[PDB]
């Protein structure tokens, strides 16, 4: 009918994932937004990000290969 029986395998784990299994990105293009410093300062955004700790934050994307570090830039 609409009742489904489940089989479980619990003898030993098939795999171990990282404690950071569910991780997140910020696209490299965001660093071209002139508001970048202000946006990442948002208290709301920090609160939401902390909810996902532990996690990796990967900063990358297509613009990864079109961004240059300028150590003289203000």
């Amino acid at each position: 009918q609409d009742v489904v029986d489940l089989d479980f395998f619990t003898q030993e784990p098939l795999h171990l994932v990282s404690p950071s299994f569910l991780s997140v990105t910020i696209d490299a293009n965001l660093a071209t937004d002139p508001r970048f410093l202000i946006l990442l300062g948002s208290p709301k955004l920090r609160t939401l990000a902390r909810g996902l700790s532990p996690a990796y934050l990967r900063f990358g994307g297509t613009k990864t290969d079109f961004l240059i570090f300028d150590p003289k830039k203000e």
Binding site: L6, F8, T10, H15, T64, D65, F66, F69, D70
Partner: protein
């Protein structure tokens, strides 16, 4: 328009501070398209950045290049896998010479194999696999420009991910057996996501199913494109409002542990009822070693009732059922947990994520087009202890 732009020390600082103050570990992709006249990676710019970050005491992991499989189309230059591997070895040496204590290096962040074979991934791993700490690849199910709600609910679409995973893992097994494999950038639909789709409750089936299958098939880390940004697949929009996939991810983080088990349906498998099983996240103060977290997707257009196998039947179960809130149905940008809309309490306070205790021995009700977590309490599973 020219894609090339610059970024400052202040930009590096705010990104590092954002990661550090949120309890996240930053991975920074370096520019692989700075090349010498001899076809090698020119490390001059990266050296400046490494020196700066090391001077500041920043603990940062590194990547080099993004989707090198498309360099020929995006930049008019072809870098083969052997050469990319040599470039990664050069970067590895720079990291060893730095004052970074155990900086990790990940790569090559290649696009998914598709129908073809990951020839570039294989040559890269032969040449440079010894210096990377995990293999990164990317995946999207669909083109954001043409995806429809039907596609987001389609188990055939969901199943296409299985073959992509198998192809990557086979390449890694044949060149660097037991090297860790990570999804380094992944979401529902490419090209910025599907408008009015990738930011809705309906996006959750692809996201939860991808996590379930990744865990079950040996992917160690899955990096969601994006936490925050302008793309329709963002977890948080630029008004700083969380989308339904944010709350799905928060519940996953709180409930699902590191030990991957297995669950399956006894009957015929139409692939619309999809079930996954881990030990419960031990960091959750509500639960204890031995508890199990079942999570499940129901893509049928009618309610299904799950019966737990003995002895887990007649255990106390905590339900975390997610359903769309409001008149938009599956296309809603708001989501309810056990009938209560999820919203921040204020700008610095996440809401309580309260379980609904079920009557012991009751079958688990999963409405049409919904997904849920079920924590099986006092399961006393030795593999979880």
């Amino acid at each position: 328009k020219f894609k090339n732009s610059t970024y400052s020390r202040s930009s590096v600082d705010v990104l590092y501070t954002f990661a550090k103050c949120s309890g996240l570990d930053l991975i920074f992709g370096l520019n692989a398209l700075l090349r010498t006249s001899d076809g090698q990676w020119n490390s001059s710019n990266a050296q400046l950045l490494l020196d700066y970050c090391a001077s500041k005491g920043y603990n940062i992991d590194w990547e080099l290049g993004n989707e090198p499989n498309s360099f020929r189309k995006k930049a008019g230059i072809f870098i083969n896998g052997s050469q990319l591997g040599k470039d990664f070895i050069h970067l590895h040496k720079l990291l060893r010479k730095s004052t970074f204590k155990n900086a990790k290096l990940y790569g090559p962040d290649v696009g998914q194999p598709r129908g073809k074979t990951a020839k570039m991934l294989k040559s890269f791993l032969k040449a440079g696999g010894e210096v990377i700490d995990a293999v990164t690849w990317h995946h999207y199910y669909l083109n954001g420009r043409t995806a429809t709600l039907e596609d987001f609910l389609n188990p055939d679409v969901l199943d296409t991910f299985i073959s992509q995973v198998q192809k990557v893992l086979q390449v890694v097994e044949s060149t660097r057996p037991g090297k860790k494999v990570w999804l380094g950038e992944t979401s529902s639909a490419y090209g910025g996501g599907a408008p009015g789709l990738s930011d809705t409750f309906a996006a959750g089936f692809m996201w939860l199913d991808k996590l379930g299958l990744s865990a079950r098939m040996g992917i160690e880390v899955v990096m969601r494109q994006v936490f925050f940004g302008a793309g329709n697949y963002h977890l948080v929009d630029e008004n700083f409002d969380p989308l339904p996939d944010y709350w799905l991810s928060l519940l996953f983080k709180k409930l699902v542990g590191t030990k991957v088990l297995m669950a399956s349906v006894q009957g015929q498998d139409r692939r619309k009822l999809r079930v996954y099983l881990h030990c419960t996240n031990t960091d959750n103060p509500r639960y204890k070693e031995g508890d199990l977290t079942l999570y499940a997707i129901n893509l049928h257009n009618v309610t299904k009732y799950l019966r737990l196998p003995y002895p887990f039947s007649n255990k106390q179960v905590d339900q975390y059922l997610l359903r769309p809130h409001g008149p938009d149905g599956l296309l809603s940008k708001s989501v309810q947990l056990n009938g209560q809309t999820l919203k921040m309490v204020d700008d610095q306070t996440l809401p309580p994520l309260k379980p609904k205790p079920l009557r012991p021995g009751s079958s688990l009700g999963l409405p049409a087009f919904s997904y849920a977590f079920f924590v099986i309490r006092n399961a006393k599973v030795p593999a979880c202890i």
